[PDB]
Write a protein that binds this ligand. Structure first.
Ligand SMILES: *[C@@H]1O[C@H](CO)[C@@H](O)[C@H](O)[C@H]1NC(C)=O
Ligand SMILES: *[C@@H]1O[C@H](CO)[C@@H](O)[C@H](O)[C@H]1NC(C)=O
Ligand SMILES: *[C@@H]1O[C@H](CO)[C@@H](O)[C@H](O)[C@H]1NC(C)=O
Ligand SMILES: *[C@@H]1O[C@H](CO)[C@@H](O)[C@H](O)[C@H]1NC(C)=O
Ligand SMILES: *[C@@H]1O[C@H](CO)[C@@H](O)[C@H](O)[C@H]1NC(C)=O
Ligand SMILES: *[C@@H]1O[C@H](CO)[C@@H](O)[C@H](O)[C@H]1NC(C)=O
Ligand SMILES: *[C@@H]1O[C@H](CO)[C@@H](O)[C@H](O)[C@H]1NC(C)=O
Ligand SMILES: *[C@@H]1O[C@H](CO)[C@@H](O)[C@H](O)[C@H]1NC(C)=O
Ligand SMILES: *[C@@H]1O[C@H](CO)[C@@H](O)[C@H](O)[C@H]1NC(C)=O
Ligand SMILES: *[C@@H]1O[C@H](CO)[C@@H](O)[C@H](O)[C@H]1NC(C)=O
Ligand SMILES: *[C@@H]1O[C@H](CO)[C@@H](O)[C@H](O)[C@H]1NC(C)=O
Ligand SMILES: *[C@@H]1O[C@H](CO)[C@@H](O)[C@H](O)[C@H]1NC(C)=O
Ligand SMILES: *[C@@H]1O[C@H](CO)[C@@H](O)[C@H](O)[C@H]1NC(C)=O
Ligand SMILES: *[C@@H]1O[C@H](CO)[C@@H](O)[C@H](O)[C@H]1NC(C)=O
Ligand SMILES: *[C@@H]1O[C@H](CO)[C@@H](O)[C@H](O)[C@H]1NC(C)=O
Ligand SMILES: *[C@@H]1O[C@H](CO)[C@@H](O)[C@H](O)[C@H]1NC(C)=O
Ligand SMILES: *[C@@H]1O[C@H](CO)[C@@H](O)[C@H](O)[C@H]1NC(C)=O
Ligand SMILES: *[C@@H]1O[C@H](CO)[C@@H](O)[C@H](O)[C@H]1NC(C)=O
Ligand SMILES: *[C@@H]1O[C@H](CO)[C@@H](O)[C@H](O)[C@H]1NC(C)=O
Ligand SMILES: *[C@@H]1O[C@H](CO)[C@@H](O)[C@H](O)[C@H]1NC(C)=O
Lengths: 114, 452, 132, 112, 125
């Protein structure tokens, strides 16, 4: 059974920092790419970021709206993905999902306010 | 440390090489009934999706003046022109004595003596009989062999050349060039590229863009525009014996017409062979011309002089003159408009001297029918007449200039139009492309040992 | 877990990466070496020349000990007179294009008698099999 | 980028009648390795997302013999035969043949 | 250096050490416009057939390959002593030439076809 759990959400100031963490179990974490998505309230799903497996150059690709501000890193020891968000604006309020192209996570709510 | 030799197959390493490139045609050319000169059935059409992969942290050196990619295109264009003049009529029985008189029905003084009315004896489908026919000829096609005087065609002492097939057309169509297996094409994505020099933005493409084989002299028509400013590219800017290639950023609309309407008359000269002569012009006889806007030409000539001072000095005087001399194909702007070959006088376009600190220009044109192309001797072609009134609209997207020379560089420099070899018309399109050869085998030190 | 085609570095897409990262994308450049009167012979000649040139590398891989393999390691020693460098400045701070111009005039010695040591491994192996 | 258009926006479906939606793309979704990348995602309220149909017309994990899709290129449809009460939510179509990964508009399905 | 076909008159013990020289010389690179275009294709096809035949056996990429077929069909009627030291490769082909079609089939059925089947049924477990 594949289970994905997101954690680390909350409320942050407009220009603070936060660190979400996905977690995987039941399979080999080093043999799959990791994708990140989000759902703004009232709109459809959107793409956030992307990181490849460690045997396929381990590079990253980010969306245009989150270029430079958002960074994704992996950790093959703890099997925990990491999303680093900083200098956020007021439009970055959504529920962020951790997925492996087949199985998604429950998601966690991130809300920015003054 | 303990280090051994480890081989790798498939490394991304390339070196410069030369190869043979094949075509890529569009779906419009896949459905053709009037077969073009550059038609299909010789080389494959393309796919609707280009494949462009951007290469990062890659710097490559380009050189547009020593590119083999523009010398194969010339051979392919010449080879596709000789392959369309075979199935139709060879005009060998036209080398007879012509009895020509002037025509003055409704002419206007310059078309005073441009057209000639000639009568001659021609063979028919039966070898025992002959027919007496007549046709209208231009003054540039007939010479005198010594008012009913005796004339002859201008080619009767060099060769007897084939008529143009009356079903084909001379309209250019785009052609894409693709790379074979084991090779690659590198495209420079820099916006201020000048030919020779390193290019810091290199991407890999599968096939090139559509390059229309437009044949012209002293002006580049229906080309590709620049993106930021005008571009002056030369192999050696100090040597005056090398042409200067100017590229525009905004097009100048040229628009020409042939005013008088002709009638095509068919004459049978043998079994299954026909000769298309000229009949009678309905109306008045008046000259053909080209028209360029007087205000738009000023804007696109005050920008060339601005960037021509960055190589010769900020306090020099730049002067434009007309062509010096030669044959009719290099001193005049020659092009094709609907099947008739024009030779226009571009002498009012370059009539300006620039100091350091609803109007049109009418260019008189002349039309010819016996033409020699690509500077070849002994192979002409007779273009049959076109019925009706001809009008075409084109864009001017560059010039081919040539500096005169002389001392006193800081005082005055004169630029006059150039032309000649057609390899400079297609060097202005294939200037960002380069062909390389992939070498996939290499060795490197690694701590891996055999006997596992 | 079903596959997305957007995560695919294309042909020569790792040409600017380091040597330790461009070594995991060998298949992309490996598969492109074998793809597909006048003006009907030159293309055939080019295809024939492309077929017989790919075979000359597979025959060169036939000798040595690397047959049907893209990453293959041998037991030929490396002296410091070829490239006196560490493993942290070749595989992490150098490109495959920059390495093929440094070790470029030292490759004929490597490609030759030093790596054709399989002749000392095929006669050292049939003798062992002829002893029971 | 490549945009996705979903028609319709709200589709009232009777509990036990056939239903059909659509999704269209501005460019061809064919990839160099001879695959077409289309994903149909079911977004039930207050529940994890589910992948119904991947690769245009191939059934994914789960999908108890009900959902099926079809399409050649730039025009795809999803078909539901025996609609039950649990098939309430939003449906999205996502490409995977070219970065960035762009989702669809949305199609809300409610019991009428 | 002996060069191409250098050990043609040498004995079998000295000619088996220079197989690499003749291995690489089997693949090298309108009158005179179609002669080469038809010669090179035949040269490639002759090499590919031999490399496929050597490889539908158990010998894929080795210059010297010894198998487990008994010496029954090929009647040499001579012991190893006076073969590898008193005979050349040209004289060998004169003796065993009739038995080179019933020994090329014992290498494809009695070997690497049967042999490849118990290995498929032993990595099963
Ligand atoms: C040309 O000459 C012929 C006589 O051969 C005459 O019939 C015809 O009208 C003339 N045409 C013109 C335009 O002068
Ligand atoms: C055609 O031939 C006739 C007699 O053969 C001659 O009188 C006439 O002048 C010729 N016409 C020409 C040469 O144009
Ligand atoms: C083209 O640009 C390169 C580098 O930018 C320069 O070295 C070269 O002189 C230039 N050539 C001309 C004709 O401007
Ligand atoms: C000429 O330029 C105009 C832009 O002013 C463009 O719309 C037109 O397509 C051009 N004609 C060509 C390239 O034949
Ligand atoms: C360019 O021309 C100058 C003189 O016009 C000459 O001295 C020089 O060798 C030429 N070539 C260059 C600069 O590469
Ligand atoms: C010119 O002559 C042709 C005869 O073929 C006729 O069809 C056409 O209408 C004429 N032009 C005009 C403007 O009437
Ligand atoms: C050429 O034609 C266009 C439209 O057909 C017209 O606007 C333009 O004025 C013409 N050219 C000239 C120089 O008048
Ligand atoms: C436009 O060109 C004419 C031709 O010489 C010149 O007299 C005039 O000064 C020019 N006008 C401008 C604004 O450049
Ligand atoms: C030439 O002089 C003009 C004066 O406006 C100046 O803008 C330009 O930069 C100068 N070009 C040089 C010095 O190359
Ligand atoms: C160039 O212009 C001069 C005017 O001074 C004229 O005499 C000459 O014939 C012209 N030459 C060409 C080729 O147009
Ligand atoms: C072009 O015009 C000039 C002056 O208007 C004239 O001298 C010349 O003869 C004309 N023709 C050619 C071919 O230069
Ligand atoms: C150049 O312009 C002057 C004055 O506008 C004019 O007298 C002269 O004839 C022009 N030259 C040509 C070749 O038309
Ligand atoms: C180019 O170099 C940078 C170094 O910061 C690296 O991050 C990037 O991945 C390189 N480009 C490619 C295509 O690998
Ligand atoms: C290591 O091998 C190379 C092979 O070219 C040789 O040049 C060098 O002298 C050798 N170093 C030794 C044997 O110490
Ligand atoms: C390699 O690294 C060691 C320490 O890790 C250092 O002492 C040595 O100088 C390095 N080699 C070179 C060639 O710099
Ligand atoms: C390798 O040797 C050749 C000998 O011709 C020389 O040209 C080349 O510069 C050498 N390579 C380096 C990196 O010095
Ligand atoms: C060639 O024959 C002679 C005569 O028997 C013999 O002595 C010699 O060894 C032979 N050559 C070789 C290379 O064995
Ligand atoms: C083995 O040798 C005997 C002797 O004549 C022969 O009959 C038999 O066919 C041989 N076996 C094979 C498989 O050829
Ligand atoms: C082996 O071959 C030799 C010939 O050199 C022969 O004399 C001997 O009898 C053979 N041995 C057997 C057991 O056949
Ligand atoms: C093999 O067959 C051929 C053809 O029948 C025959 O001439 C030859 O003698 C046979 N081989 C032997 C060793 O008898």
């Amino acid at each position: 059974e594949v289970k994905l759990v997101e954690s680390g959400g909350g409320l942050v100031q407009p220009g603070g920092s936060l660190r979400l963490s996905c977690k995987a179990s039941g399979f080999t974490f080093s043999d799959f790419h990791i994708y990140w998505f989000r759902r703004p309230p009232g709109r459809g799903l959107e793409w956030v970021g992307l990181i490849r497996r460690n045997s396929y150059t381990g590079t990253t690709n980010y969306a245009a709206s989150v270029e430079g501000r958002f960074t994704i890193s992996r950790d093959d020891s703890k099997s925990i993905a990491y999303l680093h968000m900083s200098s956020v604006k007021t439009e970055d309020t959504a529920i962020y999902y951790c997925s492996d192209d087949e199985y998604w996570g429950q998601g966690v709510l991130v809300t920015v306010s003054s | 440390e303990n280090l051994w030799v480890t081989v790798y197959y498939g490394v991304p390493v390339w070196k410069d090489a030369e190869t043979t490139l094949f075509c890529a045609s569009d779906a419009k050319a896949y459905e053709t009934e009037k077969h073009n000169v550059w038609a299909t059935h010789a080389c494959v059409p393309t796919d609707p999706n280009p494949q462009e992969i951007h290469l990062e942290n890659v710097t490559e050196e380009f050189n547009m003046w020593k590119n083999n990619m523009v010398e194969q295109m010339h051979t392919d264009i010449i080879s596709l022109w000789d392959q369309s003049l075979k199935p139709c009529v060879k005009l060998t029985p036209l080398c007879v004595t012509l009895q020509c008189t002037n025509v003055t029905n409704n002419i206007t003084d310059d078309m005073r003596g441009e057209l000639k009315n000639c009568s001659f004896n021609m063979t028919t489908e039966l070898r025992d009989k002959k027919q007496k026919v007549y046709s209208l000829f231009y003054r540039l096609d007939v010479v005198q062999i010594n008012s009913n005087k005796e004339y002859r065609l201008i080619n009767c002492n060099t060769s007897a050349c084939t008529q143009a097939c009356p079903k084909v057309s001379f309209e250019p169509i785009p052609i894409h060039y693709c790379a074979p297996a084991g090779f690659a094409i590198l495209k420079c994505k820099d916006k201020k590229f000048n030919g020779t020099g390193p290019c810091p933005s290199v991407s890999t493409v599968q096939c090139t863009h559509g390059i229309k084989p437009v044949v012209s002299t002293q002006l580049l028509l229906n080309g590709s525009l620049a993106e930021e400013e005008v571009m002056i590219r030369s192999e050696n800017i100090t040597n005056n014996a090398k042409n200067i290639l100017v590229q525009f950023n905004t097009p100048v609309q040229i628009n020409c017409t042939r005013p008088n309407n002709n009638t095509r008359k068919s004459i049978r000269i043998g079994p299954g062979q026909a000769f298309y002569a000229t009949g009678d012009i309905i109306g008045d006889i008046r000259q053909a011309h080209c028209n360029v806007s007087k205000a738009t030409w000023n804007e696109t000539l005050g920008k060339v002089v601005k960037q021509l001072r960055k190589h010769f000095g900020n306090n020099t005087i730049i002067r434009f003159a007309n062509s010096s001399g030669g044959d009719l194909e290099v001193t005049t702007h020659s092009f094709n408009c609907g099947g008739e070959f024009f030779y226009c006088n571009t002498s009012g376009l370059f009539n300006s001297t620039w100091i350091s600190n609803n109007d049109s220009i009418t260019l008189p044109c002349r039309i010819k029918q016996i033409i020699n192309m690509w500077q070849r001797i002994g192979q002409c072609m007779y273009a049959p007449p076109i019925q009706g009134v001809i009008r075409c609209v084109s864009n001017i997207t560059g010039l081919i200039l040539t500096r005169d020379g002389g001392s006193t560089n800081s005082t005055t420099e004169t630029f006059r139009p150039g032309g000649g070899d057609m390899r400079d018309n297609w060097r202005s399109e294939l200037y960002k492309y380069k062909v390389v050869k992939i070498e996939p085998l290499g060795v490197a030190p690694t701590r891996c040992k055999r006997r596992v | 877990a079903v596959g997305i085609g957007a995560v695919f570095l294309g042909f020569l897409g790792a040409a600017g990466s380091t040597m330790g990262a461009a070594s995991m994308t060998l298949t992309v450049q490996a598969r492109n070496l074998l793809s597909g009167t006048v003006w009907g012979i030159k293309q055939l000649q080019a295809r024939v020349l492309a077929v017989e040139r790919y075979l000359r590398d597979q025959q060169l891989l036939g000798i040595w000990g690397c047959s049907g393999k893209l990453i293959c390691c041998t037991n030929v020693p490396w002296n410091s007179s070829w490239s006196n460098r560490n493993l942290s400045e070749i595989w992490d701070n150098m490109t495959w294009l920059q390495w093929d111009k440094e070790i470029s005039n030292y490759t004929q010695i490597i490609y030759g008698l030093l790596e054709e040591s399989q002749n000392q491994q095929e006669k050292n192996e049939q003798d062992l099999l002829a002893l029971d | 980028d490549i945009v996705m258009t979903q028609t319709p926006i709200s589709l009232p479906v009777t509990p036990g009648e056939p239903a059909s939606m659509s999704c269209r793309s501005s460019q061809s979704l064919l990839h160099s390795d001879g695959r077409t990348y289309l994903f149909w995602y079911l977004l039930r309220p207050a529940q994890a997302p589910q992948l119904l149909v991947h690769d245009v017309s191939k059934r994914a994990s789960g999908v108890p013999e009900r959902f099926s899709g079809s399409g050649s290129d730039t025009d795809f449809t999803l078909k539901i035969s025996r609609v039950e009460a649990e098939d309430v939510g939003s449906y999205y179509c996502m490409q995977g043949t070219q970065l960035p990964l762009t989702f669809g508009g949305g199609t809300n399905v409610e019991i009428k």
